[PDB]
Amino acid sequence: VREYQKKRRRERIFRAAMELFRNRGFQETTATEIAKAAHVSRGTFFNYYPYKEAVLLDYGSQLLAGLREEVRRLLAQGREPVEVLRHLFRVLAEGTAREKDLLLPMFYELLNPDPVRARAAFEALPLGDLIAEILKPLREQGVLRQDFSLERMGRTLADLYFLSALRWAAYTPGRDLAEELEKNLRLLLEGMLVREAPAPG
């Protein structure tokens, strides 16, 4: 019964932290406030979350798992990969705009000077690999280059999302994030060089 109590405890702390973060702000909330609200010692909080940002990483990982489930659903339903890609970025744009205040500090964590944490943030938010899954069918379909691995390409697109999202959130919140993300997709997918227009129907 310890495992169940342990999972119950982590989940409660998470909820407590998220409620406080949403109502008072991430930076303004302290481990002491979180512990109090979750009904646990501060020491217990740190045992589950050694540093506050780890709560946000937990959150982003949850958001990503929901998107993954969505993408896999659309692909199994037979949606064209390119459309799923365009769908994913549209949903990423919407979710990022909606959760801007919590995602911003989480975004900086990927740029943490301490390599151990930058690494932990990275592994917790594998958007790059989700994108790779969508590219996979395109490759077997023969329309995708093969001089670069699916992994490195997906990672490149995920890096663009990250930079555009961070910049939008930190510096230009008034701009159209959906359009900006569509641009990254269109450029990396089709390239800057013009392509052949099909014979009209």
Ligand X SMILES: CCCCCCCCCCCC(=O)SCCNC(=O)CCNC(=O)[C@H](O)C(C)(C)COP(=O)(O)OP(=O)(O)OC[C@H]1O[C@@H](n2cnc3c(N)ncnc32)[C@H](O)[C@@H]1OP(=O)(O)O
As a whole number of angstroms, the distance between CA 127 and CA 119 comes to 14
Q: What tokens were used for 149?
A: 């691995």
Q: Are 33 and 17 a contacting pair, CB within 8 Å?
A: no
User: Does 110 participate in binding ligand X (rule CB under 6 A)?
Assistant: yes
Breakpoints of the chain, after residues (C–N > 2.5 Å): none
- Cβ neighbours, 10 Å, residue 70: 15
**Cβ partners under 8 Å of residue 60, min gap 6:** 103, 106, 124, 125
**Of residues 58-87, which lie at the interface with ligand X (CB under 6 A)?**
60, 63-64
Given the rule CB under 8 A, which residues bind a copy of itself? 108, 111, 113, 115, 118-119, 135, 138, 142-145, 147-148, 152-153, 156, 159-160, 162-163, 166, 170-171, 183-184, 186-197, 200-201
User: Does 154 participate in binding ligand X (rule CB under 6 A)?
Assistant: no
CB of 196 to a copy of itself, least distance (A): 5
Q: By the criterion CB under 6 A, which residues form the site for ligand X?
A: 60, 63-64, 92, 95, 110-111, 115, 118-119, 122, 125, 127-128, 149, 151-152, 158-159, 161-163, 166-167, 171-172, 174-176
